[PDB]
Amino acid sequence: QPDPNAFYGLM
């Protein structure tokens, strides 16, 4: 998602 929290999981 566009969320920064979930954005970290993208890694």
What is the C-alpha to C-alpha distance for residues 3 and 7, in angstroms, rounded to an integer? 6
Tokens of 3: 């969320």
Block residue for tokens 């969320």: 3
Tokens of 5: 């929290």
Block residue for tokens 């954005």: 7
Residue 8 CB neighbours (<10 A): 8
For the chain, give the residues followed by a break (C–N over 2.5 Å). none
Name the experimental technique.
Answer: NMR
What is the C-alpha to C-alpha distance for residues 6 and 9, in angstroms, rounded to an integer? 5
What is the C-alpha to C-alpha distance for residues 9 and 11, in angstroms, rounded to an integer? 5
What is the C-alpha to C-alpha distance for residues 1 and 5, in angstroms, rounded to an integer? 9
Q: How far is CA 6 from the centre of its chain?
A: 3
What is the C-alpha to C-alpha distance for residues 2 and 6, in angstroms, rounded to an integer? 8
